[PDB]
Amino acid sequence: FXXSXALL
């Protein structure tokens, strides 16, 4: 969840 892991 929350995108790819780049930002979150």
Numbering used by the authors: 1 to 8
Task: Tell me what the authors wrote about this structure, in their words.
The crystallographic phases of the higher-resolution data were determined by molecular replacement using the KI-soaked structure as a search model. The asymmetric unit contains two molecules of epi-Novo29, which exhibit only minor differences in conformation. In the X-ray crystallographic structure, epi-Novo29 adopts an amphiphilic conformation, with the side chains of Phe1, d-Leu2, Leu7, and Leu8 creating a hydrophobic surface and the side chains of d-Lys3, Ser4, and (2R,3S)-hydroxyAsn5, as well as the N-terminal ammonium group, creating a hydrophilic surface. An intramolecular hydrogen bond between the main-chain NH group of Ala6 and the side chain OH group of Ser4 helps enforce this conformation. In the lattice, epi-Novo29 packs so that the hydrophobic surfaces come together, with four sets of epi-Novo29 molecules forming a hydrophobic core. The macrolactone ring of epi-Novo29 adopts a conformation in which the main-chain NH groups of (2R,3S)-hydroxyAsn5, Ala6, Leu7, and Leu8 converge to create a cavity, which binds ordered water and acetate anion. Although epi-Novo29 is much smaller than PSMα3 (8 residues instead of 22 residues) the epi-Novo29 molecules daisy-chain through intermolecular hydrogen bonding to form extended structures that resemble the larger α-helices of PSMα3. In contrast, epi-Novo29 exhibited no MIC activity (>32 μg/mL) against any of the bacteria, thus indicating that the 2R,3R stereochemistry of the hydroxyAsn residue is critical to the antibiotic activity of Novo29. Inversion of the 3S-stereocenter of the (2R,3S)-hydroxyAsn residue of the crystal structure, followed by geometry optimization of only the side chain of the resulting (2R,3R)-hydroxyAsn residue, afforded a crystallographically based molecular model of Novo29. The only difference in structure is that the side-chain amide NH group of the (2R,3R)-hydroxyAsn residue hydrogen bonds to the carbonyl group of Phe1.
Novo29 is an eight-residue depsipeptide comprising a macrolactone ring and a linear tail. Novo29 kills bacteria by inhibiting bacterial cell-wall synthesis, with no detectable resistance occurring upon serial passaging. We also report the X-ray crystallographic structure of a hydroxyAsn epimer of Novo29 (epi-Novo29), which may provide insights into how Novo29 binds bacterial cell-wall precursors.
